[PDB]
Design a protein around this ligand. Structure first.
Ligand code: NA
Length: 429
């Protein structure tokens, strides 16, 4: 068996570590730095090294006979943890710094999507109110107008009528004409439809798709309030039909993987695509970003019947084309429990009461922003604190069970959406 290192401290990393621990191919499994959930997990050992301390991480891997490292979050990737590990001969599943630009830089990706003709939102920047008005007159509504400097919730206008679009442009650029006020807007195509997260493993040349999922990015029930990292997800996502899946692979995933290689930035690791699927079943890329992996990873790992270590090892050896993935036929669903105030300011340090003292059948509480202190109290340590995850025979039953398991977990200001899964439950799924 091989010792395994998971880098990071979110709920995705708890889930990855928990799943890895099931592999007969794994001996010890470490999480750097991990969180209270991985501390509590008997099969995982937290290591007190920051996810962005590359020298510390490499020293650890070189001293604890780590046969495979799996990287969850963005921060270590964009500073080249993968480059460092590979220079030292260590097997690591994640993108190089250069490849990580696709997930780390919105500008890099907009340019990439354009030059590869990958479906995504058209956009144009303006400082001149007359050029902007001519452009929104040409495109017509619906259309999105964005500016910086305004109050929270007022920087993005989704204009649904021509007047709304003209008003937005005129209001957000007001003062540039006569006063050189210095304002700037971006006008972007409105992507309508339904969201899906499409996650794949990539070995440079081959791709192994993970189960589909649907996250709930707005903080409030009924898709209201500000955006977040994601308030809960379920798998699989019915909006991704077999036909839509083919279109995603053909129009998005293969062009992306091939394009990155063609530019001399071969991509390896998980690739998390946030998509909008139109009513006619056509995909558009919102972003490639690690936010399309948490809390999406949690329900996916509950459903995975394949060996995660096996697959990630194949992903470091160029062998994904030899592998298949196996899944529980049942759906799974996770509900995030968040600290009141998220995604704006929120309190840290609250003692969490009612956590499960034993694993239960068909459910799991994955920790994200939590810390286990010296008195064995678990305290809140982030905006998203837990993801209470369940399997069920239908999305409706998975939803019921997840909210059942969440019921006794308490701290001051705890909150969640109550409608995780609604778009699938509304279909009878
Ligand atoms: Na997410």
């Amino acid at each position: 068996a091989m010792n395994i290192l998971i880098i990071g401290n979110g709920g995705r990393e708890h889930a990855l570590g928990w799943k890895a621990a099931q592999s007969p191919l794994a001996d010890k499994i470490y999480v750097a730095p991990g969180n209270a959930g991985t501390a509590l997990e008997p099969t995982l050992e937290n290591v007190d090294i920051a996810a962005t301390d590359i020298a510390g991480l490499l020293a650890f891997a070189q001293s604890h006979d780590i046969g495979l490292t799996i990287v969850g979050p963005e921060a270590p990737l964009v500073i080249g943890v993968v480059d460092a590990f590979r220079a030292a001969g260590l097997a690591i599943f994640g993108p190089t710094q250069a490849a990580a630009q696709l997930e780390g830089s919105k500008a890099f990706t907009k340019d990439f999507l354009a030059r590869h003709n990958i479906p995504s939102a058209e956009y144009q920047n303006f400082t001149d109110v007359e050029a902007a008005l001519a452009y929104v007159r040409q495109k017509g509504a619906p259309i999105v107008i964005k500016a910086d400097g305004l109050a929270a919730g007022k920087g993005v206008i989704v204009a649904m009528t021509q007047e709304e679009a003209e008003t937005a442009v005129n209001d957000m650029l007001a003062g540039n004409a006569f006063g050189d006020a210095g304002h700037r807007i971006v006008v972007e195509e409105f992507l309508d439809g339904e969201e899906a997260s499409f996650i794949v493993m990539v070995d440079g040349e081959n791709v192994l798709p993970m189960a589909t999922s649907q996250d709930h990015k707005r903080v409030g029930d009924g898709d209201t309030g500000p955006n977040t990292g994601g308030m809960g997800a379920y798998s699989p996502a019915p909006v991704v039909t077999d036909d839509v899946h083919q279109r995603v692979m053909d129009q998005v995933i293969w062009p992306t993987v091939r394009g990155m290689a063609a530019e001399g930035n071969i991509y390896t690791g998980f690739l998390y695509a946030g998509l909008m699927i139109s009513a006619d079943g056509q995909p558009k890329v919102i972003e490639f970003n690690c936010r399309f992996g948490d809390p999406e990873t949690q329900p996916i790992m509950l459903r995975m019947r394949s060996d995660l270590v096996e697959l990630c090892l194949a992903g470091t050896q160029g062998k994904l084309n030899e592998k298949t993935s196996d899944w529980d036929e049942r759906p799974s669903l996770g509900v995030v429990l968040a600290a009141g105030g998220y995604p704006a300011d929120y309190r840290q340090g609250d003692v969490i009461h009612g956590l499960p003292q034993q694993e239960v059948k068909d459910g799991k509480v994955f920790h994200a922003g939590t810390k286990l202190n010296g008195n064995h109290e678990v305290v809140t340590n982030g905006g998203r604190v837990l993801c209470v995850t369940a399997l069920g025979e239908t999305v409706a039953q998975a939803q019921q069970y997840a909210y059942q398991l969440a019921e006794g977990i308490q701290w001051e200001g705890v909150f969640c959406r109550k409608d995780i899964g609604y778009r699938a439950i509304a279909r009878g799924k």
